[PDB]
Design an enzyme around this catalytic site. Structure first.
Site, PDB file in Angstrom:
ATOM      1  CB  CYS A   1      -2.229  -6.475   0.083  1.00  0.00           C
ATOM      2  SG  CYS A   1      -3.094  -5.673  -0.961  1.00  0.00           S
TER       3      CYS A   1
ATOM      4  CG  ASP B   1      -1.873  -0.857   1.028  1.00  0.00           C
ATOM      5  OD1 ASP B   1      -2.339  -1.460  -0.067  1.00  0.00           O
ATOM      6  OD2 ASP B   1      -2.925  -0.891   2.265  1.00  0.00           O
TER       7      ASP B   1
ATOM      8  CG  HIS C   1      -5.385  -1.252  -2.463  1.00  0.00           C
ATOM      9  ND1 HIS C   1      -5.577  -1.605  -1.158  1.00  0.00           N
ATOM     10  CD2 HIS C   1      -5.145   0.165  -2.417  1.00  0.00           C
ATOM     11  CE1 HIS C   1      -5.250  -0.408  -0.504  1.00  0.00           C
ATOM     12  NE2 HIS C   1      -4.839   0.516  -1.261  1.00  0.00           N
TER      13      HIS C   1
ATOM     14  CG  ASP D   1      -3.303   3.770  -0.725  1.00  0.00           C
ATOM     15  OD1 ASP D   1      -3.348   4.965  -0.317  1.00  0.00           O
ATOM     16  OD2 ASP D   1      -4.377   2.953  -0.135  1.00  0.00           O
TER      17      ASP D   1
ATOM     18  CG  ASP E   1      -3.026  -5.588  -5.087  1.00  0.00           C
ATOM     19  OD1 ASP E   1      -3.973  -5.186  -4.887  1.00  0.00           O
ATOM     20  OD2 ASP E   1      -1.959  -5.807  -4.209  1.00  0.00           O
TER      21      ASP E   1
END
Lengths: 359, 359
Positions: A343, A107, A239, A191, A241
């Site tokens: 993550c 992150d 995010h 992020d 991913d």
């Protein structure tokens, strides 16, 4: 040079794995509310400012330690962020708040080449998260790495739509479609996790926490050597991913629920788009942050070795039919904190070179 | 019923399109050697067991994806085989080998009426190809289709003439004439692609991969409702759809280089035999499998719409003088894998009924 990673799949050699210790529930504020499912609002409402259930954190610690053991077994060097108490309340001239955690290195840190970049962040509770990783970063720096800190935002009210109409995920998803997010373009924020690397092309997405100024800053900072492209998906969630996880040269995992509007760019590139099977995680297990799609949030040790959740059998079978060795690790409780393998880690060094896979 | 196709020309509604992904060069064995032109023997000799040139495969993927796009545009429902790594080495009690690909659904599946038939195959590297298509097949099965698997051969040495004298295409073609093929009549074997459907009459040919036991099995399994006839051609080459592609009720494309010995049966039937013009594909483009005649290996979307190679202008003009709308698609790189449109697809459903066109 200790720091060197150009993509998400070359043979992993060094990695930073987060920490579940002293994690705090973030104060229930606008940008937090815009990132959580209704089901949990009362948890943040009452628990905000206190630690996540200490019994739950203890299980996470245990699961992450094993992950680290297996990583070492796989020949990967593991570094961890420093222990820090995230309950401390700090105050900047623009706001006051308590911390979150140093659980997800993805992150906040991204590595492009020999350069390590600390993301600005976009949550008040995450303003001073970088403190947990400075010892590691200074060590790589003394050893030769390039070190960069994107401009830290002020995070004044001006950065947030104080009246962002989210009252359900159905409001967020429509607004998102409209280009409406809790963050404004008042200043650069993002992020690192909204960026996924594929050699000379990095892909990013505008999200609740990554605005267009954030993306242009990155684009402008890495050019001409690197091309940062913006792609979008249906029912966007922050995010990247967990929506578009690139696992190999021209092979990507596309979340079936969040199809990419630009999928054709990749189809034309001769890329293999794989749609993982549905997660099997129990709806009663709490995921204060994230969605059940963490199952596709995999970490590749190399092209043929993937670290996948020990409980997600269906996705395990997929990798196997594909010739990819599954390294099953259980992190069911660590998932609650908001992330899977990709993550909970940040690859510092992978054996390989810079190339183009978009032709 | 999802599965329903009686011929090669009725209005196409559903189709399965192959995959170029993870394709492997088959080990250079006798039956493989008997199917490849001298020019490529050293490629198989050195490359056997590895993937086809990954750069080339990437171009194929891209070309096939577009084909799928156009198919969808034309109102055809597209299904694809599952992604699988064909480099895995399996071992039966009779032999050991690696895989090939799931690129040509026509080579392995044939649809007659409401029945889907998996061919036995005749190459060791293709023993477990059916695995790639079982998800689709089980789905049609649950939905009502009849499902059949012809007897899977043992593929013991007994099925092959270990001393088949091929040293050039000039040896194969003479032997062929003599009735000599690399496969014996030790057991039933065949590729579905040596069968071309015309309603109540299916036509087949003895070839390097389809022996007479294979043909009699089919003949015996579909009778009395269907008549499987055996026809032969000059300088035979396996897979009939590149020598005698039936494109309409009584209209057939006869390869000028491979004239049919029984052409009179059709002349007497009042059938229109069309000889396509010569291919224009560059001799420097690699066709590891097949010949330049892939240009006539067309797929009919219906009686008046044909999907023809975007580069083969001469044959395009022919269809046009005939009143057939050309739907030009480029698959130059996909051709290298050994097939054109008819080979890269398998029609699961066409709108129409069973009839006789041989009167």
């Amino acid at each position: 040079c200790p720091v060197s990673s150009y993509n998400e799949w070359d043979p992993l050699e060094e990695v930073i794995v987060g920490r579940a210790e002293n994690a705090c529930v973030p104060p229930f504020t606008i940008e937090v509310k815009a990132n959580t499912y209704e089901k949990y609002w009362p948890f943040y409402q009452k628990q905000g400012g206190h630690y996540f259930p200490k019994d739950h954190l203890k299980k996470a610690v245990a699961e992450i330690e094993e992950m680290c053991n297996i990583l070492k077994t796989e020949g990967v060097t593991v570094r961890r962020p420093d222990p820090i108490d995230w309950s401390l309340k700090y105050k900047t001239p623009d706001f006051e708040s308590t911390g979150l955690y140093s659980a997800m290195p993805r992150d906040i840190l991204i590595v492009v080449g020999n350069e390590i970049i600390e993301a600005p962040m976009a949550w008040r509770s995450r303003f001073f998260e970088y403190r947990a990783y400075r010892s590691i970063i200074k060590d790589y720096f003394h050893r030769g790495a390039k070190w960069t800190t994107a401009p830290k935002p002020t995070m004044a009210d001006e950065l947030y739509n104080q009246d962002y109409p989210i009252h359900s995920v159905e409001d967020r998803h429509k607004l998102a479609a409209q280009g409406k997010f809790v963050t404004t373009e008042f200043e650069p924020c993002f992020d690192a996790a909204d960026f996924i690397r594929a050699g000379r092309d990095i892909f990013a997405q505008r999200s609740q926490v990554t605005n267009y100024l954030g993306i242009e800053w990155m684009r402008r900072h890495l050019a001409p050597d690197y091309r940062v492209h913006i792609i979008s998906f249906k029912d966007p969630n922050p995010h990247i991913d967990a929506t578009f996880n690139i696992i190999g040269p021209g092979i990507v995992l596309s979340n079936p629920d969040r199809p990419c509007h630009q999928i054709d760019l990749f189809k034309k590139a001769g890329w293999t788009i794989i749609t993982p099977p549905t997660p099997i995680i129990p709806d009663d297990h709490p995921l204060w942050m994230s969605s059940k799609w963490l199952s596709m949030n995999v970490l590749m040790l190399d092209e043929k070795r993937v670290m996948v959740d020990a409980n997600e059998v269906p996705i395990q079978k997929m990798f196997e039919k594909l010739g990819i060795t599954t390294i099953k690790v259980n992190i069911r409780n660590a998932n609650s904190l908001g992330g899977g393998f990709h993550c909970w880690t940040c690859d510092v060094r992978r054996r390989g070179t810079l190339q183009s896979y978009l032709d």
